[PDB]
């Protein structure tokens, strides 16, 4: 009874890659996707310079070694909050894929929101929605800037309410709000299909694997 | 017995004379007095019924996703328009 | 919210010009609130009335709350010197016993 | 395993060197009345005009030519302590590129 | 009865606060795993700010040996009138056929840069490809 939710719940965190993760991407993969191209020197946030790994004629090019570590954290960071059957918000504002991500959020089982973002959606959710509505446990930003290139009101928002936040960061993003930041190439569509594949086979791996460790533990308890 | 038998009875029973028929007696199925636009939009965990719930506007969004995958397949698989004449836009 | 506490820091009757009453009055009131365990936060709260201005800014200070460290439960862990605009604020560490000896505001 | 560093100095991308007046192939995968949307496989596409001769014949999946100019169209602007993208790149469309 | 104050510390230390202090008695459920699996850097609020005098960036300029050699291909011949086609990923233009045979006399130890230019520009005229020295 007592020992089968905490096993459940206490088990998975035992593991650095309880979920397997890792076997998704590969450097060699995300190169494919040009998820290594960033803006020229001009657009640059200063605080995308660490992520940088040098300018080849003026494009800024981006890691993909820092990417792959980040992208292992972020990835396996959204598996935990998946299996303990969180709620996870898509979000972007790029209209070229807003029909993508809403269809990803579909697939995976979880929530997107790629339309104009209401003031007070977080930090006034009880007046929009009702008095109990649950806000999501984990917002993922698949893009960090508005359509006016100034941060996704989302951004700060979610950290004034305490949710942690799995957003791609380009070379003029600014990542610093973000808690698990995957620095990599937001503007091509084959970046961004590729990540949006990541994000839906971690999500749909780990609510299997919850299913597969509830069957489990609970036939031992009449076994 | 049917909604119209039960407005003629209402009507016999408690005849009133005000101008304004909104203002009169009325025995009506709940469906049609209460706004229709109030209910639960989330079960018991918390987790909203439909993927678009934190837009705050999921059906008319809902709609809009449908009618615009409609127009890719269209546009990407590829007469007479005016198959209907005499028709308006719903308002 | 029965282990906070809230006092009051300042209270200004201001009045602007508006066609309601020609000059129109205001209210703004700032408070402070804190458990008295190491959760504090202040917040403004403006209204045309006192009563209103008192709960707008006692329930959004509860939104803003500060987790500030104490050396042992009783003071700070180290000086403090600081200047925030045009104001200078000074504070030193100290041993048992020796008491809040500070601006009355600091004190509260 | 093929390192990163490996794979950029030997990449199509790299091998071009400067991108203006540049030859290269793209792809149109979008069309909004004449204006066609062409990725030549770099971070931002390109939006060209249907020529008049053999219009019909651009049409989704077509592969083409192009005259790059530059990757990113971006400029900065008095006042402004950042570049101004419209995240877009420059081309010249020279017409379809011969199966054979 | 929260933080809403997202310039100073961060999610998970602000979070860490409110349980000491006693306001949030239930953990969130993302908690325990972001003990577990912290991000590389901590997500705390930093200010963008300018450099100013003689501060600089730290971005190193990407240029490989071959560039040396593609410049001078490009001066000389321009671009390949063979169009480059950046899909496939294994292409090989024009010029970098050059810049490989180029390479390969360099090898056998030949010093001097004009020597290697007008051998490599033969060496492919065998191979068939057209080179036009295009000088407009
Ligand atoms: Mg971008």
């Given at each position: 009874g007592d020992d089968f939710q905490s096993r459940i719940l206490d088990t998975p965190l035992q593991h650095s890659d309880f979920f397997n993760v890792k076997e998704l991407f590969s450097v060699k993969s995300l190169f494919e996707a040009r998820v290594h191209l960033?803006?020229?020197?001009?657009?640059?946030?200063?605080?995308?310079?660490?992520?940088?790994?040098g300018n080849r004629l003026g494009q800024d090019i981006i890691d993909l070694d820092q990417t792959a570590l980040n992208l292992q954290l972020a990835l396996n960071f959204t598996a935990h909050v998946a299996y303990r059957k969180g709620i996870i918000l898509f979000v972007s504002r790029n209209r070229?894929?807003?029909?993508?991500?809403?269809?990803?959020?579909?697939?995976?089982?979880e929530y997107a929101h790629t339309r104009y973002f209401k003031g007070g959606l977080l930090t006034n959710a009880q007046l929009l929605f009702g008095p109990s509505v649950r806000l999501p446990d984990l917002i993922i930003f698949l893009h960090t800037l508005n359509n006016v290139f100034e941060p996704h009101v989302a951004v700060r928002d979610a950290?004034?309410?305490?949710?942690?936040?799995?957003?791609?960061?380009?070379?003029?993003?600014?990542?610093?709000?973000?808690?698990?930041?995957?620095?990599?190439?937001?503007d091509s569509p084959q970046a961004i299909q590729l990540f949006c594949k990541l994000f839906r086979t971690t999500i749909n791996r780990a609510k299997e694997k919850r299913r597969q460790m509830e069957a489990l533990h609970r036939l031992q308890s009449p076994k | 017995f049917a909604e119209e038998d039960i407005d003629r009875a209402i009507a016999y029973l408690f005849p009133s004379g005000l101008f304004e028929k909104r203002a009169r007696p009325m025995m009506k199925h709940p469906?049609?007095?209460?706004?229709?636009?109030?209910?639960?939009?989330?079960?018991?965990?918390?987790?909203?019924?439909?993927?678009?719930?934190?837009?705050?506007?999921?059906?008319?969004?809902?709609?809009?996703?449908?009618?615009?995958?409609?127009?890719?397949?269209?546009?990407?698989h590829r007469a007479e328009s005016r198959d209907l004449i005499g028709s308006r836009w719903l308002i | 919210y029965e282990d906070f506490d809230t006092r009051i820091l300042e209270v200004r009757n201001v009045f602007n010009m508006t066609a309601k009453e020609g000059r129109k009055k205001s209210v703004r009131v700032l408070?402070?609130?804190?458990?008295?365990?190491?959760?504090?936060?202040?917040?403004?709260?403006?209204?045309?009335?006192?009563?209103?201005?008192?709960?707008?800014?006692?329930?959004?200070?509860?939104?803003?709350?500060?987790?500030?460290?104490?050396?042992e439960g009783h003071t700070i862990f180290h000086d403090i010197s600081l200047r925030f605009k045009r104001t200078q604020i000074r504070m030193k560490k100290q041993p048992r016993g020796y008491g809040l000896r500070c601006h009355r505001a600091i004190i509260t | 395993v093929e390192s990163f560093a490996s794979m950029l100095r030997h990449s199509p991308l790299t091998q071009l060197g400067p991108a203006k007046d540049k030859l290269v192939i793209g792809?149109?995968?979008?069309?909004?009345?004449?204006?066609?949307?062409?990725?030549?496989?770099?971070?931002?596409?390109?939006?060209?005009?249907?020529?008049?001769?053999?219009?019909?014949?651009?049409?989704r999946g077509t592969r083409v030519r192009l005259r790059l100019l530059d990757l990113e169209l971006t400029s900065r602007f008095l006042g402004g302590t950042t570049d101004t993208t419209i995240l877009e790149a420059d081309a010249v469309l020279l017409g379809l590129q011969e199966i054979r | 009865a929260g933080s809403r104050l997202e310039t100073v510390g961060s999610v998970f230390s602000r979070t860490r606060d409110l349980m000491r202090a006693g306001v949030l008695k239930e953990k969130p459920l993302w908690y325990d795993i972001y003990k577990a699996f912290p991000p590389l850097r901590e997500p705390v609020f930093r200010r963008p700010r300018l450099r100013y005098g003689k501060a600089k960036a730290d971005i190193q300029d990407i240029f490989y040996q071959e560039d040396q050699?593609?410049?001078?291909?490009?001066?000389?011949?321009?671009?390949?009138?063979?169009?480059?086609?950046?899909?496939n990923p294994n292409f090989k233009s024009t010029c970098q056929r050059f810049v490989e045979k180029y390479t390969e006399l360099q090898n056998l130890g030949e010093t001097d840069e004009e020597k290697l230019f007008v051998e490599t520009g033969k060496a492919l005229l065998a191979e068939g490809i057209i080179l036009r020295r295009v000088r407009e």
């Open positions: 960033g803006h020229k020197a001009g657009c640059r946030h200063r605080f995308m310079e660490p992520y940088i790994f070229q894929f807003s029909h993508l991500i809403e269809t990803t959020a579909q697939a995976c089982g950290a004034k309410m305490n949710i942690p936040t799995v957003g791609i960061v380009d070379t003029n993003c600014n990542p610093c709000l973000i808690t698990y930041p995957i620095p990599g190439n937001d | 469906e049609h007095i209460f706004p229709k636009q109030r209910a639960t939009q989330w079960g018991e965990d918390g987790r909203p019924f439909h993927f678009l719930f934190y837009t705050g506007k999921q059906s008319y969004y809902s709609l809009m996703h449908d009618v615009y995958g409609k127009v890719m397949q269209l546009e990407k | 408070v402070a609130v804190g458990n008295g365990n190491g959760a504090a936060g202040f917040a403004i709260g403006k209204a045309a009335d006192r009563g209103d201005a008192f709960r707008k800014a006692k329930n959004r200070a509860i939104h803003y709350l500060h987790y500030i460290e104490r050396y | 792809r149109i995968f979008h069309i909004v009345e004449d204006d066609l949307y062409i990725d030549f496989g770099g971070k931002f596409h390109c939006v060209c005009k249907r020529p008049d001769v053999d219009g019909e014949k651009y049409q | 050699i593609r410049a001078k291909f490009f001066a000389t011949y321009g671009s390949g009138q063979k169009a480059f086609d950046l899909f």
